[model samples]
Target: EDPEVLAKNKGCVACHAIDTKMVGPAYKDVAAKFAGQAGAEAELAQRIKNGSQGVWGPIPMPPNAVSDDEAQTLAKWVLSQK
Candidate 1:
């Protein structure tokens, strides 16, 4: 399935928008922030699985039900938003 569809199924869109900010930073912003960074995919995937805080703001991103592979795919899609 397409990554966008996967993200929707995973409920990521509830807090994250593709190009605009919602409760969390936008995917395009994520892409811009991590552009040219090595290991960003793994890092983002880990964050998705384990959740994170203080990176974007006070609104911590709660852990999701996505698998490692799904998180990676979602990371790839998010990073591609730029």
Candidate 2:
């Protein structure tokens, strides 16, 4: 597993999973949304860095508080779920 995975363990699992929806979209949900969209990597990286919300519900995904480097790592990991 990526170290970022371990680092995010405290909070990520509370809201997300690989194949099932939770508080936020699943990893699969994100992948499916961007299925045919090109240039999704950069798009997702920015969202992850700045934080995201409302794709699933009224609950906002409070800012990630992760560094750009860490957010990049998470973004890459997220897209790979495809």
Candidate 3:
């Protein structure tokens, strides 16, 4: 009830699903690209907060309201979606 619950509460599911792609990239596909990189956790967490463009394609993730701590959890979760 920590992260998944928080994801729903924090509105991450709007574009990031457990299975398919929404306006954002598929959580599963993103995880595929991130298969074996632990360092991506740090960078992705930052990107989650800062908003990233061109990394996942033309559409940007856009800056979000996730906290530093919360960002890490979600990033880790997304990376595991594969």
Number of colliding residue pairs in each model: 0, 0, 0
Residue 6, model 2: lDDT of 47
Q: State the lDDT of candidate 2 residue by residue for 1-82, as single tens digits.
A: 5834643663777777888888788987888788778888777777766776775577877776667677777777777787
Measure candidate 3: CA RMSD: 1.4
lDDT of 2 at 80: 73
Question: Candidates' lDDT values, in order?
Answer: 0.89, 0.73, 0.84
Best-first order by lDDT: 1, 3, 2
Pairwise lDDT winner, candidates 1 and 2: 1
Winner on lDDT (2 vs 3): 3
Model 3 Cα displacement at 31 (Å)?
1.1
Error of 1 at 47 (Å): 0.5
* Clash count, candidate 1: 0
For every candidate in turn, the CA RMSD to the true structure comes to 0.8, 2.3, 1.4
Q: State model 1's lDDT.
A: 0.89
Worst 10 residues of 1 by lDDT: 73-82
How many backbone overlaps does candidate 2 show? 0
- Positional deviation of 64 in candidate 1, in angstroms? 0.4
